[PDB]
Coordinates of C-alpha atoms and ligand atoms in Angstrom, one line a residue:
X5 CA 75.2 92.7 194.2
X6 CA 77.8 93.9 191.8
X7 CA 78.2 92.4 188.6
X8 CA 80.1 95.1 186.0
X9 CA 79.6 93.5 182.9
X10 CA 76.2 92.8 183.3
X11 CA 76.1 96.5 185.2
X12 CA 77.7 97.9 181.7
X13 CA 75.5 96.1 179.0
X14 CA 72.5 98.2 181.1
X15 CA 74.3 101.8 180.9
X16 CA 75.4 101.4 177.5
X17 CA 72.0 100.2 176.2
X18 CA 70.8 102.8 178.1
X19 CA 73.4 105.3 176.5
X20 CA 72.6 104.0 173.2
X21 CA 68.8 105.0 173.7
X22 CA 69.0 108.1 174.4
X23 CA 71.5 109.6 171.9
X24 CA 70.8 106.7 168.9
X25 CA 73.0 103.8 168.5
X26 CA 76.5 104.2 168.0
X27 CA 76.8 106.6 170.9
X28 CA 79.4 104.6 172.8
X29 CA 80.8 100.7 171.6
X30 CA 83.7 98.6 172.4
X31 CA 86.5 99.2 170.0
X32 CA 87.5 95.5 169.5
X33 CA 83.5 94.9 168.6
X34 CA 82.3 93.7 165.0
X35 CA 78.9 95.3 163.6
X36 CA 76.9 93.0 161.7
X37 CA 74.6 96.4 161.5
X38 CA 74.5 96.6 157.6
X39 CA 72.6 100.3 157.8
X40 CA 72.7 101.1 153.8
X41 CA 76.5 102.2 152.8
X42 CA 78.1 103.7 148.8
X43 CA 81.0 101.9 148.7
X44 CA 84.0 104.2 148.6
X45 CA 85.9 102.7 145.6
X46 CA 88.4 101.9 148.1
X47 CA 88.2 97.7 149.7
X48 CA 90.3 98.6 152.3
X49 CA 88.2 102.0 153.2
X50 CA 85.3 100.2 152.5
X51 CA 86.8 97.7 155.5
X52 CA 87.7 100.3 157.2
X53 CA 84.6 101.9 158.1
X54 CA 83.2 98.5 159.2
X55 CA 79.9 99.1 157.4
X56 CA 81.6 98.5 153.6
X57 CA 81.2 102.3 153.1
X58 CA 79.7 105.3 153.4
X59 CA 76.8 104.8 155.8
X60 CA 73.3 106.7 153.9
X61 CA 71.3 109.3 154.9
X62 CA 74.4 111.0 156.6
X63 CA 77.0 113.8 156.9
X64 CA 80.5 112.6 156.1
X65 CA 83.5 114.7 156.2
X66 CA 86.0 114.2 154.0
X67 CA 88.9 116.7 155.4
X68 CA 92.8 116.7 154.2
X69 CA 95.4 118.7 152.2
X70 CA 94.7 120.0 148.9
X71 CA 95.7 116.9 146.4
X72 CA 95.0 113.8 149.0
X73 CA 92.8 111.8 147.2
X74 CA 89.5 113.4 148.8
X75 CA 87.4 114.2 146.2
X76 CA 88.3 110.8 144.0
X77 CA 87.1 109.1 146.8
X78 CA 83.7 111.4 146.6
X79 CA 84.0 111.0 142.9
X80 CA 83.9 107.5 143.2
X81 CA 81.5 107.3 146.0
X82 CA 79.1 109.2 143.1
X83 CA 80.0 106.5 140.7
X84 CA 78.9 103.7 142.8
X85 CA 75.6 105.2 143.4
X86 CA 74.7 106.2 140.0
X87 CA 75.1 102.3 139.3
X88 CA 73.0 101.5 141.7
X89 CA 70.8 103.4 140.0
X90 CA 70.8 106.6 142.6
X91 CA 70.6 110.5 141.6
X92 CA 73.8 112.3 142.4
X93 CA 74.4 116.3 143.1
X94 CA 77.4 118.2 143.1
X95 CA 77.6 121.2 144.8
X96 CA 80.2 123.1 143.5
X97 CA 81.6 126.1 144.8
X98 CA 85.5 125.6 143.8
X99 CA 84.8 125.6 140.2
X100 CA 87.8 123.2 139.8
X101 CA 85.6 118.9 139.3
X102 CA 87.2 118.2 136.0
X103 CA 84.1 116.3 134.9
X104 CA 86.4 114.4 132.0
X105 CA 88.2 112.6 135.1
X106 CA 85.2 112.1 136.6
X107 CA 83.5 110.0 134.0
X108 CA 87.0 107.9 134.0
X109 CA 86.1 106.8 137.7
X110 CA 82.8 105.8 136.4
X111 CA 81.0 108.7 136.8
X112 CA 77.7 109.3 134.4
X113 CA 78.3 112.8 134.3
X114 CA 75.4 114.2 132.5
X115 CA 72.7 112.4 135.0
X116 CA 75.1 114.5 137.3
X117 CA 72.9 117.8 138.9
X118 CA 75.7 120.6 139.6
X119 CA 75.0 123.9 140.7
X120 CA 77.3 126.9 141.3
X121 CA 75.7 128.7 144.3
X122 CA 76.4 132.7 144.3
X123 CA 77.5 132.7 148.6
X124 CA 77.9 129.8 151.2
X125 CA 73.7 130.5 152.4
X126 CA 72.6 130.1 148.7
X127 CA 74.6 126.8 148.4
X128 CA 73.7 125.2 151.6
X129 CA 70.3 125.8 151.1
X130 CA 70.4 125.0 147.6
X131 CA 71.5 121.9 148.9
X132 CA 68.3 121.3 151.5
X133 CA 66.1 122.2 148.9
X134 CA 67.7 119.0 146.9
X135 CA 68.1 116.9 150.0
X136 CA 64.3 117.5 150.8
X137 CA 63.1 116.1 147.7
X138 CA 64.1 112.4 148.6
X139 CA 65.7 112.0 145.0
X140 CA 69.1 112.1 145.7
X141 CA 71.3 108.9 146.9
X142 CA 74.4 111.3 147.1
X143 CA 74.9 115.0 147.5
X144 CA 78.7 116.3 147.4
X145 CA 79.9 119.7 148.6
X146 CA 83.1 121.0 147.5
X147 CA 85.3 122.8 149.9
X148 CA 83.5 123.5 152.9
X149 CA 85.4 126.7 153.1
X150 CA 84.1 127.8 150.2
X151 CA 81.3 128.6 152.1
X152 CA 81.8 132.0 152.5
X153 CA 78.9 134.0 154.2
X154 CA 76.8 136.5 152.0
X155 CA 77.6 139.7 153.8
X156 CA 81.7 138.5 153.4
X157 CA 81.1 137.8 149.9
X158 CA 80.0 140.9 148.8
X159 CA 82.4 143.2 150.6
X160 CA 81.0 143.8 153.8
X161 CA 82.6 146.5 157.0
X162 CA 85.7 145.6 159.6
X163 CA 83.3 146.4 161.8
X164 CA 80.2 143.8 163.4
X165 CA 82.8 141.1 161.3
X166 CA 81.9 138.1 163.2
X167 CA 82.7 134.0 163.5
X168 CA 80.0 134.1 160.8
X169 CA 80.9 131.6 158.2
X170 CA 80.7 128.8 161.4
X171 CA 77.4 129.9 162.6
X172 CA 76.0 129.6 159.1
X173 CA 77.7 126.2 158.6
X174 CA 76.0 125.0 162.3
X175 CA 72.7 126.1 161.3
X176 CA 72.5 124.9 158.0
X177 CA 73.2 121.2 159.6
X178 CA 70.9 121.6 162.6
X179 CA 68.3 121.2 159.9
X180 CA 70.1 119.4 156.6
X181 CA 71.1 116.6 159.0
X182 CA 66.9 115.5 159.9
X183 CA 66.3 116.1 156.4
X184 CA 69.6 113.6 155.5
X185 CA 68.0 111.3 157.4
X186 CA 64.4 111.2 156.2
X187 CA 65.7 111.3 153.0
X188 CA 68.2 108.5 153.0
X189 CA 70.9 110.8 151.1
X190 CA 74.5 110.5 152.4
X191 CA 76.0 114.3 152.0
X192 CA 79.7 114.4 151.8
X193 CA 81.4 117.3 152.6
X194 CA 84.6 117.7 151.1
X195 CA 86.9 120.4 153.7
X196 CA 90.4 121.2 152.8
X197 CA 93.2 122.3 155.0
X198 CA 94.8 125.0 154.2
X209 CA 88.1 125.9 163.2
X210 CA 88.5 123.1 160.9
X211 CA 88.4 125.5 157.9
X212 CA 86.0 127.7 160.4
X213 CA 83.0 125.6 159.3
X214 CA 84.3 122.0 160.2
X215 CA 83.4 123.5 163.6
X216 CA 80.4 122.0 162.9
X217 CA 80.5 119.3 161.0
X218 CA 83.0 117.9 163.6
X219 CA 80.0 117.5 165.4
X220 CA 77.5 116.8 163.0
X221 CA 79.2 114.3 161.1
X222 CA 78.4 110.4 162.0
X223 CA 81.9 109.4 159.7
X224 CA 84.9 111.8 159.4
X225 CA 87.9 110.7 156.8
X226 CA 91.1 112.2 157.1
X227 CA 92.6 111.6 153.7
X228 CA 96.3 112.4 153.6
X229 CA 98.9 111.6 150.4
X230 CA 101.5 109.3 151.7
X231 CA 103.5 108.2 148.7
X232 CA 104.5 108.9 145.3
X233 CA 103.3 106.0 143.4
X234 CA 107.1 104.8 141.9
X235 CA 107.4 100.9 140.5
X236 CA 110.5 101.5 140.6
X237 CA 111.7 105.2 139.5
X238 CA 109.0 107.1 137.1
X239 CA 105.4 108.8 137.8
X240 CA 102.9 107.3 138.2
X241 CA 100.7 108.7 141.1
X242 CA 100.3 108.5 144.9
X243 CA 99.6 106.4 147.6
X244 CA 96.9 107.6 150.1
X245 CA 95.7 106.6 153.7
X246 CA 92.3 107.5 155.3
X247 CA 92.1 107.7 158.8
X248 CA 88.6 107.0 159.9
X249 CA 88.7 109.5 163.2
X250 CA 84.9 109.7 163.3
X251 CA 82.5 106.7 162.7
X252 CA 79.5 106.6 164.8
X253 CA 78.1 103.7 163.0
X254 CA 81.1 101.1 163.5
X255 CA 84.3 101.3 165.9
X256 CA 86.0 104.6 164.8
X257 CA 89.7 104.9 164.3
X258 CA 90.6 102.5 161.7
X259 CA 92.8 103.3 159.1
X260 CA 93.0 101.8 154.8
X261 CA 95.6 102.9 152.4
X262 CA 95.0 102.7 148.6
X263 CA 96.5 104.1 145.1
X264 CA 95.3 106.8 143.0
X265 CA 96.4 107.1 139.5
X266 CA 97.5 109.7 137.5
X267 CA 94.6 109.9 135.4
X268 CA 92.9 106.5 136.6
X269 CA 91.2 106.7 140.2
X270 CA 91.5 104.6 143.2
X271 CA 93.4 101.4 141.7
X272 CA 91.5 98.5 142.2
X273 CA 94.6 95.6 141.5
X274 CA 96.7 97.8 143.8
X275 CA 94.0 97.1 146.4
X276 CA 94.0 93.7 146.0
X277 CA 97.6 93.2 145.7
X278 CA 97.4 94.9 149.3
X279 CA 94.8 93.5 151.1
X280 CA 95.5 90.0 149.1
X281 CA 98.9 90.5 150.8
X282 CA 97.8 91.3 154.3
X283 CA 95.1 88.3 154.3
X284 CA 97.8 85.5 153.2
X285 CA 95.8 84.8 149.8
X286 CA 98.5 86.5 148.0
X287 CA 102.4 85.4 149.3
X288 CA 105.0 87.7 148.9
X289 CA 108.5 86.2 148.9
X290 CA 110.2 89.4 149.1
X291 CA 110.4 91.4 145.8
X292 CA 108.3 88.7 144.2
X293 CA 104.5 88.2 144.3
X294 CA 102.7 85.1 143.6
X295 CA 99.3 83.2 144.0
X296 CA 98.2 80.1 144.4
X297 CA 101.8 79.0 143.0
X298 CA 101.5 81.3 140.5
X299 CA 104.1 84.1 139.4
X300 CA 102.7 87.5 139.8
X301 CA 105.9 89.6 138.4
X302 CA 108.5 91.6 140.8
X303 CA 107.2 94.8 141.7
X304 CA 104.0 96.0 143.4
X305 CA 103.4 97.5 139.6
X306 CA 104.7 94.0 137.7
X307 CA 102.1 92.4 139.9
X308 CA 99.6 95.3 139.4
X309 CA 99.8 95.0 135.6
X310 CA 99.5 91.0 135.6
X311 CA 96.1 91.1 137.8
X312 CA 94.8 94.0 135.4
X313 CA 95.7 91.8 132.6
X314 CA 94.9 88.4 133.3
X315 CA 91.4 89.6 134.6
X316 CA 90.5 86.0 135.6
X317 CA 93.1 86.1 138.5
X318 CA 93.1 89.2 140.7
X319 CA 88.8 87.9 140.3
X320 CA 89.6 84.8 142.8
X321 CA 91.4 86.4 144.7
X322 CA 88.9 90.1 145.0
X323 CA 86.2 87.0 145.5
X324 CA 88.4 84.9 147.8
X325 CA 89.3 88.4 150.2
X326 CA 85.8 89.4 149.6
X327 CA 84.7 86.0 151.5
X328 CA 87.0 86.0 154.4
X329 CA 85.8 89.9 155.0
X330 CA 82.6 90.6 154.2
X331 CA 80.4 88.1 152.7
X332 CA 76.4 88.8 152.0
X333 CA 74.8 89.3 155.3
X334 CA 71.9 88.1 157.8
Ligands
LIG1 N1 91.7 116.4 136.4 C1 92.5 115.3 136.7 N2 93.0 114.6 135.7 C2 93.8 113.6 136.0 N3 94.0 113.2 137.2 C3 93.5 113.8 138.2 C4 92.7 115.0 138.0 N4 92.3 115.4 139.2 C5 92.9 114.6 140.1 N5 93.6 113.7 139.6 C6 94.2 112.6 140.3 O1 93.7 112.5 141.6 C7 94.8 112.7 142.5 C8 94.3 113.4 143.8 O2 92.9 113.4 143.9 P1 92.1 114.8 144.3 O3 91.0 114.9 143.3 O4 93.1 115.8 144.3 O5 91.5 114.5 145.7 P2 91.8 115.6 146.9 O6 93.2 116.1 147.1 O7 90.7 115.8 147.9 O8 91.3 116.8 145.9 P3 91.8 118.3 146.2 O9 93.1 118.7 145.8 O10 91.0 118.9 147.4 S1 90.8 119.0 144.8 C9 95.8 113.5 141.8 O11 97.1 113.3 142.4 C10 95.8 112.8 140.4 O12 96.4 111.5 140.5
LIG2 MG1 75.5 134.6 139.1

């Protein structure tokens, strides 16, 4: 009477119905689920997560030490959906987006809605208010430790202190997440490590994609500064087999490096040989050096085009 596979496919439909699809999914599978996603800025992210980015209408965590590459990636994630013509909020209790930067990654910062909230109840609810509208493609919160309750804020008694920053985090999503959803808004919460930052208590749970960001290298050619290497781990990802992981390069000055990427996953995917310590395509001489190579694709445009177009193909082309 027994047959398991056909005895699994029945739970885990079953499983998927009651608690939404994505609940539980081989880890080997391929979605060809497109959802709606903001690419991340990063290919190999964008990969990554199986979906080619951040999944809309929900709560991403973006957690990590200070200087990782977090909020680039959220910067950038802002950029791409201001060209695709989306309205973009930036909750900002850190008081340290450098909007200059910002418009460098593409960013159209006066469209940008930014707000300052007073304690961690004003912001989040600040935040709904937004979220409810069903204008915004994008909402970023800075530093989900930021949040700081009201009654902390304005210097409260040693005494009744409570977990109370967590609680007000849980309950803020309980009821932003539906909203999220409705509206189609993808809300990226930006935690850094210093509970997950008490409130990532939470958002842990709430979250349907989690990114660990975390700074790798120090971007060198050979010996100067130029910036850092970064790898997301994608520990979370209820939308596409979780666990993934992309590395990238952010620029001192320039965000995630789009040659770099390609150089990389060019590299990984054949297109792009690499006889050690010399690059080359299609017979062609790239230059010695990841940054040799880097600078030929930024500079001869046309190349480093065939090839983003030729990776793009064997990844993801346009679907169903
Ligand atoms: N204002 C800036 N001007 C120029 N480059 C910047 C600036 N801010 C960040 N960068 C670049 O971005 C890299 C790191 O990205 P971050 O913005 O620090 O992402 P991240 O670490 O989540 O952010 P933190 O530290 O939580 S704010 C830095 O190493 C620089 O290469
Ligand atoms: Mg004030």
């Amino acid at each position: 009477a027994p047959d398991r596979e056909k005895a699994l496919e029945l739970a885990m439909a079953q499983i998927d119905k009651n608690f939404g699809k994505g609940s539980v999914m081989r880890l080997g599978e391929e979605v060809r689920q497109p959802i709606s996603v903001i690419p991340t800025g990063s290919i190999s992210l964008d990969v990554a997560l199986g979906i080619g980015g951040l999944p809309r209408g929900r709560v991403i965590e973006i957690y990590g030490p200070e200087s990782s590459g977090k909020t680039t990636v959220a910067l950038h994630a802002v950029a791409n959906a201001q060209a695709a013509g989306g309205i973009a909020a930036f909750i900002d209790a850190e008081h340290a987006l450098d909007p200059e930067y910002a418009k460098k990654l593409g960013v159209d910062t006066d469209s940008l809605l930014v707000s300052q909230p007073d304690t961690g109840e004003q912001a989040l609810e600040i935040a709904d208010m937004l979220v409810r509208s069903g204008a915004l493609d994008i909402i970023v919160i800075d530093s989900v430790a930021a949040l700081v309750p009201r009654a902390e804020i304005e210097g409260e008694m040693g005494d009744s202190h409570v977990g109370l920053q967590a609680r007000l985090m849980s309950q803020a999503l309980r009821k932003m997440t539906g909203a999220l959803n409705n509206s189609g808004t993808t809300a990226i919460f930006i935690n850094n490590l210093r509970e997950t930052t008490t409130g990532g208590k939470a958002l842990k749970f709430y979250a349907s994609v989690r990114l660990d960001v975390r700074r790798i290298e120090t971007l060198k050619d050979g010996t100067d500064a130029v910036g850092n290497r970064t790898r997301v781990k994608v520990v979370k990802n209820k939308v596409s087999p979780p666990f993934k992981q992309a590395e990238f390069d952010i620029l001192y000055g320039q965000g995630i490096s789009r040659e770099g990427s390609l150089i990389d996953m060019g590299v990984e995917h054949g297109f792009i040989r690499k006889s050690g310590s010399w690059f080359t395509y299609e017979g062609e001489q790239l230059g010695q050096g990841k940054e040799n190579a880097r600078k030929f694709l930024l500079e001869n445009t046309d190349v480093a085009n065939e090839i983003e177009k030729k990776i793009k193909e064997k990844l993801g082309i346009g679907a169903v």
